[PDB]
Every structure is written in C-alpha cells, then in structure tokens.
Amino acid sequence: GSPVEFTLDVIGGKWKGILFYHMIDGKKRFNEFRRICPSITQRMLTLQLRELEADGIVHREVYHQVPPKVEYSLTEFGRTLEPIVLQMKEWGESNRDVLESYRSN
Amino acid sequence: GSPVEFTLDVIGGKWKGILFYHMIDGKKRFNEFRRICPSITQRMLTLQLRELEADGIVHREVYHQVPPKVEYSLTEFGRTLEPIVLQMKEWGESNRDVLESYRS
C-alpha cells in the first residue's frame, strides 16, 4: 500500500485533524472537543477518538472516581505527526483565497 | 473552517496522494497512472484527476490529434503541496511497523 495513503488513513477524514490540532497544546476532555466542533455528534466524536487511540496516536486517561474524568492527549508517537499537521494548518490558511479562485470557475 | 481540514479536502481520500506523488517526477498519461495504481478503476482515476484540476493542483494538456494525447502534470500551485505529500510518504514508510503493531 502507498505510504502517503497509509498516513492519510491515520490522520485523514473530516475530524481527526481538528481533534489532533487541539491536543497539540495539551490534554482535552470530551466536552471541550464538542465545543471545538459543534457539528460533530457525540457517537462520531467517540468513534474518531477510539480510532486515534487504537492507532496509538491518542492516549485516553480515565480517572477512577464517579463520575470518571476522561482526558485525551497526544502520545509521543502521536506528536511525530505534529509537523505534518502544522504544515496542513499553514498551507490551508495561506491558500484558502486562491483555492477559492480556482473553484470559482 | 479548520484550515487543517481545508488542506485534507484538497489532497485527501484514497487516491489523490498517490496520483500527486506520481506527477512529482514528471507529467503522466492516463494509462501511466493505471499501471502505477492497478487497483484504481478508469472511472475513479478520471474523477480524481478532474477534482485535482478543478482545485488548481493538476494541469491537463490535450493534444488535438487522433487519437488525442492527454498529459497530466502538477501546476506551480500544486507543487506547493509537495512538502506535505512527501513528508506523509516519509512518515508512512518510517512508522508503518509501529502503526500495524498498534492495530493488532
């Protein structure tokens, strides 16, 4: 399989990039992510986070009180994708206007 | 709108990264892509290349002879995605093993 597509399968799709980006500056609770993406449904957020966890990119820390505290963070392995994610942010910011021109016809 | 998800709209999905990557080293004909990517169907190849062209990433040059030659290439703009695409290639090669070990 293509290594480019292999990477995009880990970080691609509609939500993982956003989720990832917001963990760059530290751990987040589930409700913080819902405020970051008001159109994500709670089942879809849980699924996207489970897949990032399953791939070793995100750590899910559960505190054993009631109701339990749950915190999502980047693993060290996760952080190796940070340069690529930051480049996407920058390229997307820089090029939004010109992508819109090309699309405008 | 997340600028990260903006970029992924352009270069994302199952094929665009592969096709992009294969224009880095020069223009390609349609059948050249099919040989490179045997799993891709002719319909999917056509759509993906049309999406890339609509987005200003790929240039499609038609030579009006019979049968016409068509050549696909990266635009100046398109090549600005190279660091992202190549770095993803490098990450995927480097981290393939660790990632598959997490997936089992």
Number of helices and strands in chain A (H, E): 6, 2
The count of residues in chain A is 105
- Chain B residue numbers with beta carbons less than 8 Å from the beta carbon of A39 are none
Which tokens is B69 given? 């030659």
Alpha carbon distance A28, A19 (integer Å): 9
Environment class of residue B41 by beta-carbon count within 10 Å: exposed (0-12), middle (13-18) or buried (19+)? exposed
Domains and CATH numbers, chain A: 1-105 (1.10.10.10)
Residues in contact with A11: Cβ distance below 8 Å, sequence separation at least 6, in sequence order: A17, A20, A57, A81, A84, A85, B8
* B3–A90 C-beta distance less than 8 A: yes
| Dihedral angle computed from the Cα positions of residues B25, B61, A100 and B92, in that order, rounded to the nearest 10 degrees | -20
Strand-pair partners of A28: A72
Alpha carbon distance A25, A11 (integer Å): 18
Strand-pair partners of A60: A72
Q: ∠ at Cα B96 (A49, A24), nearest 5°? A: 40
* B13–A12 C-beta distance less than 8 A: yes
Facing A89 at nearest CB: one of B4, B91, B103: B4
Q: Do B4 and A97 contact (CB within 8 A), yes or no?
A: no
Per DSSP bridges, beta strands B58-63 and A69-74 are unpaired
Nearest CA to CA, how far is A94 from chain B (Å)? Answer: 9
Environment class of residue B90 by beta-carbon count within 10 Å: exposed (0-12), middle (13-18) or buried (19+)? middle
- Chain A residue numbers with beta carbons less than 8 Å from the beta carbon of B83 are 87
